[model samples]
Target: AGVSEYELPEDPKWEFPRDKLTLGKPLGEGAFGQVVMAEAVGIDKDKPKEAVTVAVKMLKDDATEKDLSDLVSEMEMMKMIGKHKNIINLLGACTQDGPLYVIVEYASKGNLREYLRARRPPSYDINRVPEEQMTFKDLVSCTYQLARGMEYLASQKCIHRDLAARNVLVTENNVMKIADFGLARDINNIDYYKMTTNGRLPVKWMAPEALFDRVYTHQSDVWSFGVLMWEIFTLGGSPYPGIPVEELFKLLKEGHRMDKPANCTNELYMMMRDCWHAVPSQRPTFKQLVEDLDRILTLTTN
Candidate 1:
């Protein structure tokens, strides 16, 4: 595939001054770095008066030069991926100094996995009403927006290796983004990631080939999307209950598939099952999935 173009210019506007960031507290210790909550004076260079709440991904001072370069590489990748309504925003970088800071948008509602789990319905039904009663329209919004975001990323030749509910963030007004927490190991580092996936891979969401032979493709991302759909419809239940990780490969190879979520309609389950095709070529593209979700989403308009 040809290299995607970088849209951002080499301007000082893309670099946020250290003084403009006011750190409130550490969000948590990420395995590779620390995430901090902060307010930056201006993500938009023109709108200097606006101070927006943001999360800063800071690399450790002790990190090697390779890690620093890796962080910089992701910033470069962002220049190519550009902006989309359903993709997380990289507001600015504060790498002018030692502590490599990647200023990004904050999701107040946290991740979708926990969000759905917290809102898990006590009584399952085909339809319901309430502020957050776990309606089909809400889940469809997450699924459709995810497809739209993934489609855009795929168009730019990016594959989300880890496409799971936990990796996706839900923003205010139920808007979702295909956020990259570990940079999703990003697109540029595939050679480095191929062998390293066994460490702590999301096997439950991975396709059989990826789970067994350490292979990942756009189709693998599609397979994971199917599992993510299950997570959405099941209100964040475990991928395969009572099935141990050790037996998953054999079971999957034997054509075993998880049953549909109780709340999920047959139409949604068929879409999800299509992603679980044993062969990579059989899976639907993100472009098709986007249109499919858009069509199905229309039914929930009521």
Candidate 2:
């Protein structure tokens, strides 16, 4: 009378070459699974002697049917997106009846939220290279990369239900890639998806409609991208620092928005404010956001 645990999809195109994989140390843990550093031997035929290091998300053996379905959905979405410089590329996945594994590009520098924090001054909330000390080019470049990735997702009609700095990965050379698609879904010709289940969400990053009724859309993602911009500018400071989650709705209802970070430019802050409009219809699309950021980046450089 219950959903089966192994309702595996019928796609061999995305199956992981498990025999070539060697799991290593644990990298991190999440509600749905654990990530480990894995060595993929002979991954490339041209360089068969070479081994590739990747981050592998392994599903918990005890995961429920819902969890299984969610993993499958994420896998399918990843496959659909294919390769993009700003989007974390999914190498493959394990479809075995036991444990599920999803391998993707590994970012040595780790999550963007922590990467920014590490650059902060010791014992001080401000970054060592405070926004004043850091080059404007570097600051805007990160934002541009994220917007570029989101634009790609929107082009494919894929919604990244969770878009935040903590969900983005940073490479050693400072490349940013969007990750964590566990909450992602395809719009499939619809503008929004109504909440069908009560699940915890990042309240501060959610749009007004999503926060109140769980309605998610591409516009909602644009709102979260705005919050992510705040996180980048603040060097990972919490949004609505002193406000409680319970009162966030009331505050938003009164047209309250987060104050600009100490060193952010007025232009950048204005871009963020535009995303927080009460009417989702009034918010800029991801394509427009990318174009705006590009213009800002050009101005900053000139």
Candidate 3:
């Protein structure tokens, strides 16, 4: 088999010490690549006392040149933004004219969607108490963290088109970090990026303009965030459950909106509804979203 040649960005500080990394069991897989657990031997010079554990995402064996190029672009963007507390840290990357390997901080609890699904409360009643593993307070905290992360991205002129609970990873300490930058884009001064081709997208989470006209903006991401809020409140429940993909456009055009998660508070649901406003310009900015979520977290905690 021939190794795919890939031209990756030059980042001395972000280059992986290939010999120092020992790959472990597969953590997960997607259309372009698979992520595996890895232990880095002295990769972190600052933390020499502790062996650093990371997640290495590598392109699949059959990935095309375009896939490798896309991965490289995503890594370049990661390097550009540097680091944020609520965003996954790109520790390093391996791109020695072969299959790309991007290493990041490992989230022991995995994706937030699966994490919540595993610890669902027995009942769906709004008045019911949370399960043993997760509480209402914890959910609020998670939502706040997500908003904070998105707020950072928006400030950096980035749009995460796929901002679902599944793309949000949870650490052992319950810290939520946004991950999976496949569909993410850096718009810089531009307000939106119009798609020229049809691609697989999360229809349920997409805003009306994005779904029908193939336009994506920061507000589109905000719309997706609202669906993410639904996922968090519903313990990873599917958004617009029972709605078919083909008919979603018609329904949304007819002024249909998803019902509030039975267990979600009215205040939080109102925040979500605000994101679904017909006019994209009317949607709340991520800065405002972070403020709103912080207020909700404080009220719920107190």
Candidate 4:
């Protein structure tokens, strides 16, 4: 079976006092931790600026020691990520104190997956949906935000190996904030070996090279961008439909491609197709992708 639906890991040793935990509605929960809508309580409590809301994340108990190590690694990575508007801002983190909580700026709006799924008559092919479909212009803006964030990441010489809409936070006004540092890594070229372990396997959202479990580079990110492009075009459709894991590589080797839904126009389709090109090096960089998409949007505007 493929990846199971995300479950919150539990641990008994992880005990924190109820008085220390400030709980609002649960924001989101995942493998390593779950974020709660929360507020900080401390000497800074009276300061209106310090009283701001936040997404408080607490590490899950069942996570292996390795997972805990990665959480520490994620914090280290954040330290290096200094001020980038495109990246999600980490308001603050508490480690020495009890409970070890990470406080992130609150996004009243949720992730793209939940946000899109919440749309009336939610489905990937926006054109086919009759009511309140997310428009092409809206998608372009979202992708642009992705590009801007990716551009900043590239400048830092860090490639966000995991590039999916689900990892981005879409604000009410459509501001995209990239999140989830646990899966990211630094890389230069797009080349990857056929062997790997523990690396996040995002098969359907990956290039054929990545699907092969090869070492991922920046170009592999482009391959993911192609799937992401389709996701945006279809309003968040699953990357592969009716295709099982074992048959994926075989089908890909035989020139099989996940077809873009009919509702997507030629321009967008072609752009996505170019991204899925077999040769990893041939795929465009984020800068190039932004340019090509701009041209497509401009032509469509005319």
Candidate 5:
């Protein structure tokens, strides 16, 4: 996994304190920048009504050139997306100053992470006010949305590289949309993400290959999908709560995978195990995921 270094045009500059960009409340802050809710003042007519309410991310000035360039790449990639229903639409972008600011469709309900943390105990009930665990219906529906977007993304030969509930948006009807293209990469490119020497932090949701710091294959993503299944079932519990992060990578390298929780239903647990296989090739494809999830829905409805 190698990375391609890039930078935005110098003449237009970056988006910081620009006239057309208006910053709203801070959404969250990260190493590269502080994400804020923002609105596009004069971008275009095609913008979503929600983009009128957006997450305006402001990259830090002190960030290295490479970091800044990465931000530019993300903005450029987002600008190219069509009106995808399952994707969080990029409304517009401005680079008039030294910082890049992008406006994306706002998810008033917040991301899956905060939604989970707000709950008292993880469960699949969304209407309990502060607690918002997704029901099985909600899980399948969201999975359907994710697979639809993944199919679209895979068709373009683009790997999301980072597909988790935290990065997905859930609307009022439980409609799920993929968001945050910041970590996406074109798989065909020569520059691929390389395995880290210390090994990447263990994300229980990822397959053995990904956790072992191997190349970012679609199969590896399928592994992640399995973990996502757990998340959907448990309402966003940590991948392996008691295990330390370092041990996660170590155990994965040794060919260990998470076992199904004792209480998990046979159908759901089998679905989870299928994704945890060490062999990336054996994991179901996004298309297959869509079909399986559909079967779950059909069984329930009948």
Candidate 6:
């Protein structure tokens, strides 16, 4: 539902030999399907061509040809989207045979959802018990990085239809990268338009226009980014918690927005609201968001 179909590229440099990629244990749960830690012998274009660990995204079960083709199709999109420090770049893909593979850069610290949750204490009032490592600055940093990552994507025509805390990756240096390109529909026809474990219409983080008209744009992504800010401030909690999607949509229709989170700053919450503007054009551009977050980051550091 989220992906805009594009023609696949036919450059040999983009394709990785299926044999060169050695699969290993599952890295983590991918929103689309399975992502595993893999070793690639010829992943690089130069150097000694030694072993290099990377993340390989694939379908959970070996399914039909459509599934494999879909998997390969999205691979070219990621590669074409190109690289950024906060955007996971596609290394190569093995589209030669069955069980097609997407080899990408490995983010050692895993996804941001679990990473934030692990650092949060049960009694997680920030003032009472400060997280030793993950300070408020860390949270702001993650948000800023996401803004820049998405800025790059928006600069291109790519729209991240599924931008959630679950979809963002945390690297070894704790930098956040906007990831998970596929729309996550199972080629088997089982999984389609499912919410992030909420069991409703996929309208949880969706913008009003997107939900109503089925149109996705950068502004729609801005609305999703607002929810993402809430998730970050709440230490990776699900959005619109304890509410149904129908109720959520009605609230959005009526211009009812979520209350500021317990630990979220007034400044931060304002930014969130800026993204949730009823008019998509009213939302802040990613470039503007980067500047806004930069200002807040400076303030928080002091």
Instruction: Name the best candidate (by TM-score).
Output: 3
| Each prediction's TM-score versus the true structure | 0.84, 0.91, 0.92, 0.80, 0.80, 0.84
Cα lDDT for residue 261, candidate 5: 49
In candidate 3, residue 61 scores what lDDT? 85
Tell me the tens digit of each residue's lDDT in model 1 across 174-241.
78988763444445545323635564466688788777777777777889899989989998788998
Better of 1 and 4 by TM-score: 1
Q: CA shift at 118, candidate 6, in angstroms?
A: 0.8
Candidate with the larger TM-score of 4 and 6: 6
- As for lDDT, the candidate ahead, 4 or 6, is 6
Per-residue lDDT over 103-197 for candidate 4, one digit per residue giving the tens place of the 0 to 100 score: 66666677876565554243264324245456676677667677777777776667677778788786656677888776666554433434365
lDDT for each residue of candidate 5 in 1-302, tens digit (9 for 90 to 100)? 12233344543322333565678788777676667877665455565332255677657757765566566667766665555778877765666444567767777766765554454343474445554544556556666677778777766666676777777776556567787777676776553455555433336555566555556776666777677667666666667768886677777777766666433577878877887777777878878877887888778657
The segments of candidate 2 whose C-alpha lies over 4 angstroms from its true place after superposition are 1-5, 121-134
Provide the overall lDDT of each model, using Cα atoms, as 2-decimal numbers.
0.77, 0.83, 0.83, 0.67, 0.65, 0.77
User: How many angstroms is residue 204 displaced in model 5 relative to the true structure, after the best TM-score fit?
Assistant: 3.3
Q: In model 5, state the lDDT of residue 30.
A: 69
Q: Check candidate 2 and list the clashing pairs.
A: none
- Please say which candidate is ahead in TM-score: 1 or 2: 2
lDDT, model 1, position 193: 34
Show where candidate 4 strays beyond 4 Å.
1-21, 40-50, 120-132, 188-198, 298-302
Candidate 1, residue 196: the lDDT equals 50
lDDT for 282 in candidate 4 is: 80
Candidate 1, run of 10 with poorest lDDT: 1-10
Give candidate 2's error at residue 46 in angstroms.
Answer: 4.4
